Symmetry: C3
Subunit: 133 residues, 3 copies
Protein backbone atom coordinates (compact mmCIF):
# COMPACT_ATOMS: atom_id res chain seq x y z
CA UNK A 1 0.00 0.00 0.00
CA UNK A 2 1.38 3.37 -1.09
CA UNK A 3 0.31 6.82 0.12
CA UNK A 4 0.82 9.59 -2.44
CA UNK A 5 -0.64 13.10 -2.53
CA UNK A 6 -2.57 14.83 -5.31
CA UNK A 7 -0.62 18.09 -5.15
CA UNK A 8 2.76 18.25 -3.41
CA UNK A 9 2.28 21.92 -2.53
CA UNK A 10 -1.25 21.73 -1.13
CA UNK A 11 -1.00 18.37 0.63
CA UNK A 12 2.04 16.73 2.21
CA UNK A 13 2.12 13.09 3.30
CA UNK A 14 5.24 11.54 4.84
CA UNK A 15 5.50 7.99 6.18
CA UNK A 16 8.12 7.26 8.84
CA UNK A 17 8.81 4.47 11.34
CA UNK A 18 10.57 6.11 14.29
CA UNK A 19 9.99 3.05 16.50
CA UNK A 20 12.79 1.02 14.91
CA UNK A 21 10.19 -1.44 13.63
CA UNK A 22 6.54 -2.45 13.22
CA UNK A 23 5.24 1.03 14.03
CA UNK A 24 4.67 2.93 10.80
CA UNK A 25 3.27 6.40 11.37
CA UNK A 26 1.77 8.34 8.48
CA UNK A 27 1.95 12.10 8.93
CA UNK A 28 -0.54 14.05 6.82
CA UNK A 29 -0.19 17.82 6.91
CA UNK A 30 -1.18 20.81 4.81
CA UNK A 31 1.69 22.92 3.49
CA UNK A 32 0.71 26.55 3.99
CA UNK A 33 2.20 29.62 2.31
CA UNK A 34 2.63 33.07 3.80
CA UNK A 35 1.15 36.16 2.14
CA UNK A 36 3.27 39.30 2.19
CA UNK A 37 2.49 42.89 1.25
CA UNK A 38 4.10 46.20 0.32
CA UNK A 39 2.69 49.67 -0.38
CA UNK A 40 -0.86 48.35 -0.11
CA UNK A 41 -0.21 45.75 -2.79
CA UNK A 42 -0.11 42.04 -1.92
CA UNK A 43 3.07 40.15 -2.82
CA UNK A 44 4.33 36.59 -2.49
CA UNK A 45 7.50 35.62 -0.62
CA UNK A 46 9.65 35.14 -3.72
CA UNK A 47 8.42 38.31 -5.43
CA UNK A 48 8.95 40.55 -2.40
CA UNK A 49 12.31 38.98 -1.58
CA UNK A 50 13.73 39.12 -5.10
CA UNK A 51 12.29 42.40 -6.41
CA UNK A 52 12.41 44.57 -3.29
CA UNK A 53 15.45 45.08 -1.05
CA UNK A 54 14.79 48.39 0.69
CA UNK A 55 13.24 48.52 4.16
CA UNK A 56 12.17 44.87 3.99
CA UNK A 57 13.46 41.89 5.99
CA UNK A 58 12.56 38.51 4.48
CA UNK A 59 13.61 35.19 5.99
CA UNK A 60 15.26 32.46 3.92
CA UNK A 61 12.24 30.17 4.28
CA UNK A 62 9.90 32.93 3.10
CA UNK A 63 12.42 33.90 0.42
CA UNK A 64 11.93 30.58 -1.36
CA UNK A 65 8.16 30.71 -0.90
CA UNK A 66 6.51 31.10 -4.31
CA UNK A 67 2.98 31.04 -2.89
CA UNK A 68 1.81 27.75 -4.39
CA UNK A 69 0.57 26.31 -1.09
CA UNK A 70 -2.70 26.92 0.73
CA UNK A 71 -3.47 29.78 3.12
CA UNK A 72 -5.15 30.11 6.51
CA UNK A 73 -7.88 32.59 7.46
CA UNK A 74 -5.59 34.72 9.63
CA UNK A 75 -3.05 35.17 6.83
CA UNK A 76 -5.68 36.32 4.33
CA UNK A 77 -7.34 38.60 6.89
CA UNK A 78 -4.07 40.29 7.87
CA UNK A 79 -3.05 40.54 4.22
CA UNK A 80 -6.23 42.34 3.20
CA UNK A 81 -6.12 44.47 6.36
CA UNK A 82 -2.65 45.60 5.29
CA UNK A 83 -3.68 46.11 1.66
CA UNK A 84 -5.30 49.08 -0.08
CA UNK A 85 -4.72 52.15 -2.24
CA UNK A 86 -2.09 54.84 -1.66
CA UNK A 87 -2.80 58.58 -1.59
CA UNK A 88 -0.32 61.41 -2.20
CA UNK A 89 0.40 63.22 1.06
CA UNK A 90 1.38 66.89 0.83
CA UNK A 91 4.10 67.52 3.40
CA UNK A 92 5.35 64.77 -0.61
CA UNK A 93 5.36 60.98 -0.92
CA UNK A 94 2.58 58.40 -0.56
CA UNK A 95 0.54 57.14 2.39
CA UNK A 96 -1.12 53.72 2.32
CA UNK A 97 -4.89 53.64 2.82
CA UNK A 98 -5.89 50.09 3.73
CA UNK A 99 -9.35 48.59 4.23
CA UNK A 100 -11.26 50.12 7.13
CA UNK A 101 -9.16 53.29 7.10
CA UNK A 102 -11.16 56.50 7.49
CA UNK A 103 -10.87 59.05 4.69
CA UNK A 104 -12.61 62.34 5.48
CA UNK A 105 -13.45 64.70 2.63
CA UNK A 106 -13.57 68.00 4.50
CA UNK A 107 -14.14 71.51 3.16
CA UNK A 108 -11.59 74.32 3.28
CA UNK A 109 -11.22 77.90 2.12
CA UNK A 110 -14.29 79.11 0.25
CA UNK A 111 -15.33 75.54 -0.51
CA UNK A 112 -18.24 73.35 0.56
CA UNK A 113 -17.78 69.59 0.85
CA UNK A 114 -20.75 67.36 0.06
CA UNK A 115 -20.26 63.59 0.24
CA UNK A 116 -23.37 61.45 -0.21
CA UNK A 117 -24.06 57.71 -0.28
CA UNK A 118 -26.95 56.35 -2.33
CA UNK A 119 -29.10 53.36 -1.36
CA UNK A 120 -27.33 51.39 -4.09
CA UNK A 121 -24.11 52.05 -2.20
CA UNK A 122 -22.73 54.32 -4.91
CA UNK A 123 -20.70 57.20 -3.45
CA UNK A 124 -21.00 60.72 -4.85
CA UNK A 125 -18.41 63.30 -3.76
CA UNK A 126 -19.04 66.91 -4.77
CA UNK A 127 -17.37 70.25 -3.98
CA UNK A 128 -19.24 73.56 -4.11
CA UNK A 129 -18.32 77.26 -4.32
CA UNK A 130 -19.99 79.99 -2.25
CA UNK A 131 -20.27 83.41 -3.91
CA UNK A 132 -22.36 85.89 -1.92
CA UNK A 133 -22.95 89.65 -2.17
CA UNK B 1 0.25 1.59 11.24
CA UNK B 2 -0.41 4.96 12.88
CA UNK B 3 -2.37 7.84 11.37
CA UNK B 4 -1.43 11.25 12.77
CA UNK B 5 -1.81 14.74 11.30
CA UNK B 6 0.87 17.40 10.87
CA UNK B 7 -1.13 20.36 12.14
CA UNK B 8 -4.29 19.92 14.21
CA UNK B 9 -5.71 23.25 13.01
CA UNK B 10 -5.21 22.81 9.26
CA UNK B 11 -5.83 19.07 9.01
CA UNK B 12 -8.06 16.77 11.07
CA UNK B 13 -7.74 12.98 10.93
CA UNK B 14 -10.04 10.70 12.92
CA UNK B 15 -9.98 6.90 12.94
CA UNK B 16 -13.18 5.08 13.91
CA UNK B 17 -14.58 1.55 13.79
CA UNK B 18 -18.28 2.39 14.09
CA UNK B 19 -19.10 0.82 10.72
CA UNK B 20 -19.68 -2.59 12.35
CA UNK B 21 -17.04 -5.16 13.26
CA UNK B 22 -13.83 -5.60 11.26
CA UNK B 23 -14.54 -2.46 9.22
CA UNK B 24 -12.30 0.37 10.41
CA UNK B 25 -12.98 3.66 8.62
CA UNK B 26 -10.43 6.48 8.52
CA UNK B 27 -11.91 9.95 8.02
CA UNK B 28 -9.46 12.58 6.76
CA UNK B 29 -10.76 16.15 6.54
CA UNK B 30 -9.45 19.71 6.35
CA UNK B 31 -10.41 22.00 9.23
CA UNK B 32 -11.51 25.35 7.80
CA UNK B 33 -11.93 28.72 9.53
CA UNK B 34 -14.54 31.39 8.80
CA UNK B 35 -13.66 34.99 7.91
CA UNK B 36 -15.71 37.85 9.37
CA UNK B 37 -15.74 41.59 8.68
CA UNK B 38 -16.82 44.93 10.14
CA UNK B 39 -16.61 48.50 8.81
CA UNK B 40 -14.75 47.26 5.74
CA UNK B 41 -12.06 45.63 7.88
CA UNK B 42 -11.64 41.85 8.02
CA UNK B 43 -11.81 40.25 11.46
CA UNK B 44 -11.58 36.69 12.74
CA UNK B 45 -14.50 35.05 14.54
CA UNK B 46 -13.04 35.61 17.99
CA UNK B 47 -12.03 39.18 17.14
CA UNK B 48 -15.45 40.21 15.81
CA UNK B 49 -17.31 38.46 18.62
CA UNK B 50 -15.13 39.79 21.45
CA UNK B 51 -14.22 43.31 20.30
CA UNK B 52 -17.56 44.48 18.92
CA UNK B 53 -20.84 44.25 20.80
CA UNK B 54 -23.22 46.66 19.07
CA UNK B 55 -25.62 45.48 16.37
CA UNK B 56 -23.70 42.24 15.78
CA UNK B 57 -24.72 38.64 16.53
CA UNK B 58 -21.89 36.10 16.48
CA UNK B 59 -22.53 32.44 17.30
CA UNK B 60 -20.70 30.56 20.05
CA UNK B 61 -18.97 28.26 17.57
CA UNK B 62 -17.71 31.26 15.59
CA UNK B 63 -16.82 33.03 18.83
CA UNK B 64 -14.05 30.53 19.56
CA UNK B 65 -12.75 30.60 15.98
CA UNK B 66 -9.25 32.09 15.98
CA UNK B 67 -8.69 31.62 12.26
CA UNK B 68 -5.95 28.99 12.51
CA UNK B 69 -7.63 26.66 10.03
CA UNK B 70 -7.75 26.91 6.25
CA UNK B 71 -10.27 29.00 4.31
CA UNK B 72 -12.59 28.34 1.36
CA UNK B 73 -13.02 30.41 -1.81
CA UNK B 74 -16.55 31.67 -1.10
CA UNK B 75 -15.59 32.87 2.38
CA UNK B 76 -12.67 34.91 1.05
CA UNK B 77 -14.76 36.26 -1.84
CA UNK B 78 -17.62 37.42 0.40
CA UNK B 79 -15.14 38.77 2.96
CA UNK B 80 -13.36 40.94 0.41
CA UNK B 81 -16.67 41.95 -1.16
CA UNK B 82 -17.72 43.17 2.29
CA UNK B 83 -14.36 44.84 2.94
CA UNK B 84 -13.07 48.30 2.03
CA UNK B 85 -12.41 51.85 3.21
CA UNK B 86 -14.78 54.18 5.08
CA UNK B 87 -15.71 57.72 4.04
CA UNK B 88 -17.06 60.57 6.17
CA UNK B 89 -20.68 61.28 5.26
CA UNK B 90 -21.86 64.89 5.49
CA UNK B 91 -25.28 64.91 7.13
CA UNK B 92 -21.66 59.22 9.96
CA UNK B 93 -19.28 56.91 8.08
CA UNK B 94 -19.98 54.83 4.98
CA UNK B 95 -18.24 51.59 4.02
CA UNK B 96 -16.80 51.59 0.50
CA UNK B 97 -16.35 47.97 -0.57
CA UNK B 98 -14.91 46.44 -3.74
CA UNK B 99 -16.83 47.12 -6.96
CA UNK B 100 -18.98 49.97 -5.63
CA UNK B 101 -19.09 53.05 -7.87
CA UNK B 102 -17.60 56.29 -6.54
CA UNK B 103 -18.49 59.27 -8.73
CA UNK B 104 -16.56 62.53 -8.43
CA UNK B 105 -19.17 64.96 -9.73
CA UNK B 106 -19.04 68.75 -9.99
CA UNK B 107 -21.37 71.21 -8.28
CA UNK B 108 -21.77 74.96 -7.90
CA UNK B 109 -18.94 76.78 -9.67
CA UNK B 110 -16.79 73.65 -9.71
CA UNK B 111 -15.55 71.37 -12.49
CA UNK B 112 -14.75 67.71 -11.83
CA UNK B 113 -11.90 66.19 -13.83
CA UNK B 114 -10.88 62.58 -13.18
CA UNK B 115 -8.26 61.11 -15.51
CA UNK B 116 -6.68 57.66 -15.75
CA UNK B 117 -3.05 57.22 -16.80
CA UNK B 118 -1.61 54.20 -18.60
CA UNK B 119 -0.05 53.13 -15.30
CA UNK B 120 -3.56 52.78 -13.91
CA UNK B 121 -2.85 55.67 -11.55
CA UNK B 122 -5.88 57.90 -11.03
CA UNK B 123 -5.52 61.68 -11.05
CA UNK B 124 -8.45 63.59 -9.59
CA UNK B 125 -8.58 67.35 -10.08
CA UNK B 126 -11.17 70.01 -9.24
CA UNK B 127 -11.49 73.27 -11.17
CA UNK B 128 -13.22 76.63 -10.76
CA UNK B 129 -15.62 77.83 -13.45
CA UNK B 130 -15.20 81.45 -14.50
CA UNK B 131 -16.65 82.29 -17.92
CA UNK B 132 -16.90 85.56 -19.87
CA UNK C 1 -10.64 -0.45 6.06
CA UNK C 2 -12.10 2.76 4.61
CA UNK C 3 -10.50 6.08 3.66
CA UNK C 4 -13.13 8.81 3.38
CA UNK C 5 -12.88 12.60 3.39
CA UNK C 6 -14.75 15.04 5.62
CA UNK C 7 -15.82 17.42 2.87
CA UNK C 8 -15.76 16.35 -0.78
CA UNK C 9 -15.13 19.91 -1.95
CA UNK C 10 -12.24 20.73 0.39
CA UNK C 11 -10.63 17.30 0.57
CA UNK C 12 -10.50 14.51 -2.02
CA UNK C 13 -9.45 10.96 -1.17
CA UNK C 14 -9.36 8.30 -3.88
CA UNK C 15 -8.36 4.65 -3.58
CA UNK C 16 -7.24 2.99 -6.81
CA UNK C 17 -5.50 -0.22 -7.85
CA UNK C 18 -3.20 -1.22 -12.80
CA UNK C 19 -3.47 -5.00 -12.60
CA UNK C 20 -3.28 -6.86 -9.29
CA UNK C 21 -1.97 -6.26 -5.76
CA UNK C 22 -0.94 -2.62 -6.07
CA UNK C 23 -3.44 -0.36 -4.31
CA UNK C 24 -2.43 3.30 -4.30
CA UNK C 25 -4.30 5.87 -2.21
CA UNK C 26 -4.17 9.38 -3.66
CA UNK C 27 -5.16 12.18 -1.29
CA UNK C 28 -5.36 15.66 -2.79
CA UNK C 29 -7.06 18.95 -1.97
CA UNK C 30 -9.71 20.14 -4.41
CA UNK C 31 -9.19 23.87 -4.93
CA UNK C 32 -11.58 26.43 -6.37
CA UNK C 33 -10.67 29.41 -8.55
CA UNK C 34 -11.57 32.98 -7.59
CA UNK C 35 -12.71 35.27 -10.40
CA UNK C 36 -13.40 39.00 -10.60
CA UNK C 37 -15.19 41.56 -12.75
CA UNK C 38 -15.36 45.36 -12.50
CA UNK C 39 -13.32 45.21 -9.29
CA UNK C 40 -15.82 42.87 -7.64
CA UNK C 41 -14.92 39.26 -6.81
CA UNK C 42 -17.13 36.54 -8.28
CA UNK C 43 -17.21 32.75 -8.19
CA UNK C 44 -17.02 30.61 -11.31
CA UNK C 45 -20.72 29.77 -11.54
CA UNK C 46 -21.77 33.35 -10.80
CA UNK C 47 -19.48 34.88 -13.43
CA UNK C 48 -20.39 32.23 -16.01
CA UNK C 49 -24.17 32.36 -15.56
CA UNK C 50 -24.78 36.01 -14.64
CA UNK C 51 -22.23 37.73 -16.86
CA UNK C 52 -22.04 37.40 -20.64
CA UNK C 53 -20.15 40.45 -21.87
CA UNK C 54 -16.42 40.41 -22.63
CA UNK C 55 -15.69 37.39 -20.43
CA UNK C 56 -14.63 33.85 -21.37
CA UNK C 57 -15.04 31.29 -18.57
CA UNK C 58 -14.21 27.60 -19.00
CA UNK C 59 -16.72 24.81 -18.33
CA UNK C 60 -14.78 23.38 -15.38
CA UNK C 61 -14.72 26.85 -13.85
CA UNK C 62 -18.29 27.37 -15.03
CA UNK C 63 -19.50 24.70 -12.61
CA UNK C 64 -17.19 26.03 -9.88
CA UNK C 65 -19.26 27.36 -6.99
CA UNK C 66 -16.21 28.22 -4.90
CA UNK C 67 -16.70 25.50 -2.29
CA UNK C 68 -13.12 24.24 -2.43
CA UNK C 69 -9.98 25.58 -0.76
CA UNK C 70 -7.69 28.28 -2.16
CA UNK C 71 -3.96 28.75 -2.72
CA UNK C 72 -1.89 31.84 -1.93
CA UNK C 73 -1.57 32.81 -5.60
CA UNK C 74 -5.34 32.68 -6.13
CA UNK C 75 -6.10 34.98 -3.19
CA UNK C 76 -3.24 37.36 -4.00
CA UNK C 77 -4.19 37.65 -7.67
CA UNK C 78 -7.85 38.04 -6.72
CA UNK C 79 -7.33 40.90 -4.25
CA UNK C 80 -4.78 42.78 -6.36
CA UNK C 81 -7.30 42.88 -9.21
CA UNK C 82 -10.14 43.95 -6.92
CA UNK C 83 -11.08 47.42 -5.71
CA UNK C 84 -13.38 50.42 -6.06
CA UNK C 85 -14.50 52.15 -9.27
CA UNK C 86 -14.22 55.88 -9.99
CA UNK C 87 -16.09 57.93 -12.58
CA UNK C 88 -13.59 58.91 -15.27
CA UNK C 89 -14.47 61.85 -17.51
CA UNK C 90 -12.91 60.98 -20.86
CA UNK C 91 -16.38 59.22 -19.91
CA UNK C 92 -17.08 55.95 -18.12
CA UNK C 93 -15.83 54.02 -15.09
CA UNK C 94 -12.29 53.05 -14.04
CA UNK C 95 -11.33 50.22 -11.66
CA UNK C 96 -9.01 51.24 -8.82
CA UNK C 97 -7.37 48.14 -7.34
CA UNK C 98 -5.08 47.68 -4.34
CA UNK C 99 -1.68 49.36 -4.53
CA UNK C 100 -2.81 51.79 -7.21
CA UNK C 101 -1.70 55.39 -6.68
CA UNK C 102 -4.49 57.97 -6.58
CA UNK C 103 -3.25 61.57 -6.66
CA UNK C 104 -5.58 64.40 -5.65
CA UNK C 105 -4.10 67.22 -7.72
CA UNK C 106 -5.12 70.88 -7.95
CA UNK C 107 -6.34 72.76 -11.02
CA UNK C 108 -7.75 76.15 -11.95
CA UNK C 109 -8.07 78.36 -8.88
CA UNK C 110 -7.95 75.36 -6.56
CA UNK C 111 -5.36 74.11 -4.06
CA UNK C 112 -5.18 70.43 -3.13
CA UNK C 113 -4.19 69.50 0.42
CA UNK C 114 -4.13 65.85 1.47
CA UNK C 115 -2.87 65.15 4.99
CA UNK C 116 -2.35 61.97 7.01
CA UNK C 117 -2.91 61.93 10.77
CA UNK C 118 -1.04 59.72 13.25
CA UNK C 119 -4.09 57.45 13.34
CA UNK C 120 -3.61 56.81 9.63
CA UNK C 121 -6.86 58.63 8.92
CA UNK C 122 -6.71 60.65 5.70
CA UNK C 123 -8.02 64.22 5.54
CA UNK C 124 -8.48 65.68 2.06
CA UNK C 125 -9.19 69.40 1.72
CA UNK C 126 -9.56 71.77 -1.22
CA UNK C 127 -8.67 75.46 -1.06
CA UNK C 128 -9.35 78.42 -3.33
CA UNK C 129 -6.62 80.43 -5.04
CA UNK C 130 -7.48 84.11 -5.35
CA UNK C 131 -4.48 86.41 -5.83
Amino acid sequence: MDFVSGDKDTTSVTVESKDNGKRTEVKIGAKTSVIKDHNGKLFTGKELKDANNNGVTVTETDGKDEGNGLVTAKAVIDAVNKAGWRVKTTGDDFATVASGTNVTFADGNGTTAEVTKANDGSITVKYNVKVAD
